Design an enzyme around this catalytic site. Structure first.
Site, PDB file in Angstrom:
ATOM      1  CE1 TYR A  68      24.317 -15.831  61.346  1.00  0.00           C
ATOM      2  CE2 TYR A  68      26.195 -14.779  62.348  1.00  0.00           C
ATOM      3  CZ  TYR A  68      25.293 -15.920  62.143  1.00  0.00           C
ATOM      4  OH  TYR A  68      25.668 -17.087  62.625  1.00  0.00           O
ATOM      5  NE  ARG A  70      38.908 -19.504  54.500  1.00  0.00           N
ATOM      6  CZ  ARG A  70      39.577 -18.175  54.587  1.00  0.00           C
ATOM      7  NH1 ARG A  70      40.128 -17.477  53.656  1.00  0.00           N
ATOM      8  NH2 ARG A  70      39.449 -17.702  56.095  1.00  0.00           N
ATOM      9  CG  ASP A 109      29.145 -17.165  55.044  1.00  0.00           C
ATOM     10  OD1 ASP A 109      29.608 -18.254  55.557  1.00  0.00           O
ATOM     11  OD2 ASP A 109      28.663 -16.383  55.855  1.00  0.00           O
ATOM     12  NE  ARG A 136      29.387 -24.102  59.117  1.00  0.00           N
ATOM     13  CZ  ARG A 136      29.738 -23.003  59.000  1.00  0.00           C
ATOM     14  NH1 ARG A 136      31.030 -22.464  58.776  1.00  0.00           N
ATOM     15  NH2 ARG A 136      28.843 -21.709  58.937  1.00  0.00           N
ATOM     16  NE  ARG A 183      36.374 -23.375  60.537  1.00  0.00           N
ATOM     17  CZ  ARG A 183      35.608 -22.852  61.646  1.00  0.00           C
ATOM     18  NH1 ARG A 183      36.266 -22.245  62.466  1.00  0.00           N
ATOM     19  NH2 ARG A 183      34.219 -23.159  61.829  1.00  0.00           N
TER      20      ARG A 183
END
Ligand SMILES: Cc1c2[nH]c(c1CCC(=O)O)Cc1[nH]c(c(CCC(=O)O)c1C)Cc1[nH]c(c(CCC(=O)O)c1C)Cc1[nH]c(c(C)c1CCC(=O)O)C2
Ligand SMILES: Cc1c2[nH]c(c1CCC(=O)O)Cc1[nH]c(c(CCC(=O)O)c1C)Cc1[nH]c(c(CCC(=O)O)c1C)Cc1[nH]c(c(C)c1CCC(=O)O)C2
Lengths: 356, 356
Positions: free
Chosen positions: B154, B40, B76, B27, B31
């Site tokens: 998922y 973003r 992703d 990552r 963020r």
């Protein structure tokens, strides 16, 4: 925008008679000012360039000290190669570097389409609009960019160089790839320069800082055609957009050998380095274009009285017509702001005595 | 593509001696970076993933701050279930959601044939080629995908879960339908991964992020066979296409119980979470494979000096051979970029002292 109050710089650039000789200084927003260094300490260099408020503050700082007849926006020529997709850093004490320079023709594949570059440089336009507003009409605001050849040298060398051997090796060994690159740069520069005017720039200077490494033959093949294309295309797009074209200045440092050609390249003003005697420059360029320059920046190390005599002599050689006073290159980081003040004051004082 | 300049990461992945220990961070484009959040803000998450320029910019951002030894493409894992025909959203503050999860065997009828998925993921390949060009050989580019079991979780849960109860209920109550789904995912993943390499990826990481919910028995029946098939089939197709196979990394978070098997599954590198002591991991996996990891990401909340001591200890436990430094999971959104810098710098500094 606010109405311009002191337009002496523009009148001089267009070749009109003025009451005194206007003066500005290359790198007037620079490290020689203690307050520049303070505002610059907060961020890295390219981050400063992306903050409209920081750029505006840096632009205004010299004007608070000195009655300069023009402001030049705080930015850098290297924003264009960055916007084309090259990574660029500012190295402490060693200046700009591209850690991955262009070395073969296949390296051109990683560049952006030049038509998208102006959209990547929106931050410069924001800086220009803000600065134009905050200047409140005091003096005109100059926008700028690097010339195609000079930008090519940074992109191939990866930084400054004393010989430009790698970039010149492209000219001699890779002429087609070199013309391809120079055209990409020209095509990026035109919409960027036009954008600067749309955003509020009242004049434009193109810096061909690495001209002197080329002799006449290479300069004519690889630098001049693109210098000409930039001016022609900028003026055309401005006319087509319904806007007033602005005076354009070409500064080719160590470009003594190209002065005649530069005076016929579609620029209102030709900037000169300190090695060309003003009277000889006037001979090469003729009677239409305006000359800008050309005091040895190191002359500012002399005493204030000596600076006054050097200015007197320079102004006597250029004459009162078709002239904007400036240094022959940018201010150096160790110069004394008071001596810069002495230069500005002497231009103003003597140029008035040379008229009245 | 441009010649690779720093190949330390690849040499380490293949088990070769290097001058220092290479480091990257899961990552790293994330963020915790103020500039990530800015770029973003312009689009929704999956729209960002479909813009090659946006993905390239996000990938490069961490490299501008830190001398990381690898870049990982911005994308992703959930692009694969989306490409299979499932609708997926990014919920503000709550993460990914599939509003219509797979709950019965008949739900498999709405999925695309897995052989068409790579054609639906052309945008990822465009991002990879662009990023590979713009990186200009600085460091290698890592491509990635989710492992079959993790993607299944998922698709059945409809999002994250603390227990994976619905997905595990498929394993126990619907074993045949589960194997059918896992095979569909494997058959989609192989051509996608191969495509990433064709497009310019220089290494591949498979994320089995939900391994730890399975015990050894279920993992051996339902996760491992597909992890093995992905690596075997990717390498075969690359060989058949005339291309050089790339090093492949398997990261099974909370997969302590599977380390021995994962080291024999056809991956060059086994990634470790922070709960496995480095010396014990080295025992389970043996002396061929390279280990990657494994610092507790929360350790980056400690002071820069404390981060340095934790890194020293981690590196002493792993040893200089067959090791790539990373965190034990991804960076969290509230971490300080300076502390990330401290981690990178300490790996580099101490690993050099552990050699010289
Ligand atoms: C050191 C450097 C920079 N940028 C550059 C260098 C030289 C690299 C080399 O060849 O080794 C590249 C550059 N930037 C600019 C030029 C044109 C020719 C020249 O003036 O040297 C060049 C060649 C215009 C400029 N560069 C800058 C301006 C803005 C106008 C202004 O600041 O007054 C311009 C037109 C701003 C700038 N840009 C930079 C600084 C430190 C500053 C502040 C001024 C100073 O103290 O030097 C970084
Ligand atoms: C929140 C989330 C996202 N995507 C996902 C989640 C977690 C959902 C849950 O279980 O509740 C799904 C996902 N995406 C990825 C994984 C692997 C395991 C893990 O790292 O958590 C998983 C499990 C890899 C990734 N996800 C991403 C990458 C790209 C590499 C990189 O961005 O550095 C990878 C490999 C990019 C991504 N993807 C997302 C964000 C916000 C980002 C930026 C990074 C950050 O701040 O977290 C959305």
């Amino acid at each position: 925008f606010p109405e311009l109050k002191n337009d002496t710089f523009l009148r001089a650039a267009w070749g009109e008679e003025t009451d005194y000789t206007p003066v500005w200084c290359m790198r007037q927003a620079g490290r020689y000012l203690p307050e520049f260094r303070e505002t610059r300490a907060a961020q890295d260099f390219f981050s400063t360039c992306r903050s409209p408020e920081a750029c505006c503050e840096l632009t205004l700082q010299p004007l608070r000290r000195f009655p300069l007849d023009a402001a030049i926006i705080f930015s850098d020529i290297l924003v264009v190669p960055q916007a084309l997709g090259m990574e660029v850093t500012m190295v402490p004490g060693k200046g700009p570097s591209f850690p991955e320079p262009l070395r073969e023709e296949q390296d051109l594949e990683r560049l952006r389409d030049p038509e998208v570059v102006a959209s990547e440089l929106g931050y410069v336009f924001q800086a220009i609009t803000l600065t134009r507003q905050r200047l409140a009409g005091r003096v005109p605001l100059i926008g700028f960019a690097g010339a195609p050849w000079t930008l090519m040298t940074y992109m191939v060398e990866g930084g400054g160089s004393s010989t430009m051997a790698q970039a010149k090796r492209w000219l001699y060994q890779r002429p087609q790839a070199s013309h391809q690159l120079l055209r990409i740069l020209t095509d990026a520069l035109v919409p960027y320069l036009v954008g600067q005017v749309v955003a509020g720039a009242q004049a434009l200077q193109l810096f061909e800082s690495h001209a002197g490494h080329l002799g006449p033959q290479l300069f004519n093949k690889f630098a001049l055609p693109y210098i000409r294309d930039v001016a022609k295309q900028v003026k055309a797009r401005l006319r087509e957009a319904g806007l007033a074209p602005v005076p354009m200045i070409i500064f080719a440092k160590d470009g003594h050998f190209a002065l005649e050609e530069l005076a016929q390249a579609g620029y209102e003003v030709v900037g000169l380095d300190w090695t060309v005697a003003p009277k000889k420059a006037r001979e090469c360029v003729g009677k239409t274009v305006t000359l800008q320059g050309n005091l040895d920046p190191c002359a500012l190390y002399a005493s204030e009285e000596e600076i006054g005599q050097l200015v007197k002599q320079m102004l006597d050689d250029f004459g009162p017509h078709r002239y904007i006073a400036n240094l022959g290159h940018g201010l150096y980081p160790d110069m004394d702001p008071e001596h810069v003040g002495a230069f500005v004051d002497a231009v103003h004082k003597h140029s008035r005595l040379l008229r009245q």
